Amino acid sequence: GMRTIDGKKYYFNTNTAEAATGWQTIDGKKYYFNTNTSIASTGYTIINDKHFYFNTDGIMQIGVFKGPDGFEYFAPANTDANNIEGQAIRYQNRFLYLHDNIYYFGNNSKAATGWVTIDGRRYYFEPNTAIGANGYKIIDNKNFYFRNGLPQIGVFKGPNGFEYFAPANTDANNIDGQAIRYQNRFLHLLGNIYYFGNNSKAVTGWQTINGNMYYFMPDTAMAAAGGLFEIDGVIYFFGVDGVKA
Ligand SMILES: CC(=O)N[C@@H]1[C@@H](O)[C@H](O[C@@H]2O[C@H](CO)[C@H](O)[C@H](O[C@H]3O[C@H](CO)[C@H](O)[C@H](O)[C@H]3O)[C@H]2O)[C@@H](CO)O[C@H]1O
Ligand SMILES: CC(=O)N[C@@H]1[C@@H](O)[C@H](O[C@@H]2O[C@H](CO)[C@H](O)[C@H](O[C@H]3O[C@H](CO)[C@H](O)[C@H](O)[C@H]3O)[C@H]2O)[C@@H](CO)O[C@H]1O
Incomplete structure (x- = not known):
């Protein structure tokens, strides 16, 4: 029987009305009831010049x-x-x-x-x-x-869309991985193609840019490129530059 009264937890030796002190293994869990107050230790606790940590319920962590x-x-x-x-x-x-x-x-x-x-x-x-x-x-x-x-470093989807977490010094001396302002332009990165709008977010879906048609994958914002792709069940050819042809 381990009771908690007035925000303080105690471990009673059942038959006697006295609370226990010291280390106690209750249900596989370890507790340390202060030897001078019988109150269960919680949080950062120093015991015999060593450090231990107990959660709000007195269980050693x-x-x-x-x-x-x-x-x-x-x-x-x-x-x-x-x-x-x-x-x-x-x-x-x-x-x-x-x-x-x-x-x-x-x-x-x-x-x-x-x-x-x-x-x-x-x-x-x-x-x-x-x-x-x-x-x-x-x-x-x-x-x-x-x-x-x-x-x-790359194009990842955040709460507001795909942002360009860029290589250092791409804009305003950003460090590696900082998302940057990058507007109305294509991004060529390691063989992948992306297009960013005025909101500095990568576009997805079918897009006509400067008269050329592209399809940017919704899960990565990368343009379909370098071969045949079946989109919505229809087969189209996309050149290595991402342009449908
Ligand atoms: C003030 C400060 O941060 N100084 C650093 C010391 O805390 C640190 O000493 C180690 O600190 C850890 C706690 O983070 C322990 O206290 C550790 O000692 C304990 O574990 C030992 C076994 O690993 C042994 O059992 C000791 O008896 C026991 O107290 C202690 O070494 C030192 C070393 O990193 O750096 C100080 O800058
Ligand atoms: C809701 C929405 O989409 N608003 C758009 C803004 O997010 C966007 O502002 C740019 O957003 C990028 C992230 O995609 C960055 O937050 C960028 O600011 C950061 O980079 C700058 C350098 O390029 C500079 O270092 C800033 O200090 C740093 O915070 C931010 O300009 C704007 C502009 O495209 O459009 C909004 O529609």
Whole structure:
């Protein structure tokens, strides 16, 4: 019987009206009831000069969580110098993969947040979680499209349409991957063809431009090009320049 009164959770040894203290394994879960108050620990907690992290319900967590000195890695037993389960450990200058989530830990064993350069590459880790960014992101009024923390160069679909996340210095000295103003013009990138309207977004569907007909795929905004394509069940030929002929 584990009850919670006045926002404070306790673990009673059933038959006696007394609350328990210390580490307790309840339902496979680990809890630490402060030895001087019997109150269940929550959040960043120092125990015997070691760091542990508990959720709002007092359950000990394994992962990357923020403490007063930044995000620490509360790892499984024997991750470094036979550390105990849930304890924060020394983890310096290296990446951490917690199944598809990527973190990078600095020299201080704290996870990096914001923009950082690692081995010559620019990354962005979410300040709220320290997790490498993924997908469309607006950062300081600039748009990026990330994959595992890395800004990608290319044409990707965002909330407002396909934007051109361009190579560095294409406009206003943008850095690699920054979405830019690119209006009423074609974009030729690695063999693919796109056309951007006045809104700096790639057009899709059938389009007549300067008298030539093109069909830009709705899922990629790339022009049909270099052969026969069946569109809406009809077969057409598109030259390597994307023009139907
Ligand atoms: C103030 C600051 O950030 N200084 C950095 C130190 O915190 C950091 O020391 C490591 O910090 C982690 C927490 O992020 C742990 O405290 C770690 O020690 C703990 O784990 C060890 C096993 O890995 C061992 O069990 C210790 O007994 C236990 O306390 C600690 O080494 C250092 C090193 O990165 O950098 C400082 O800049
Ligand atoms: C709702 C809508 O579609 N509005 C259109 C604007 O988004 C568009 O503005 C441009 O949009 C691109 C993204 O597609 C960028 O946001 C661009 O600004 C950014 O790049 C600039 C350099 O090229 C500069 O660095 C800015 O600081 C940076 O924010 C922005 O101009 C406009 C113009 O095409 O059309 C609207 O219809």
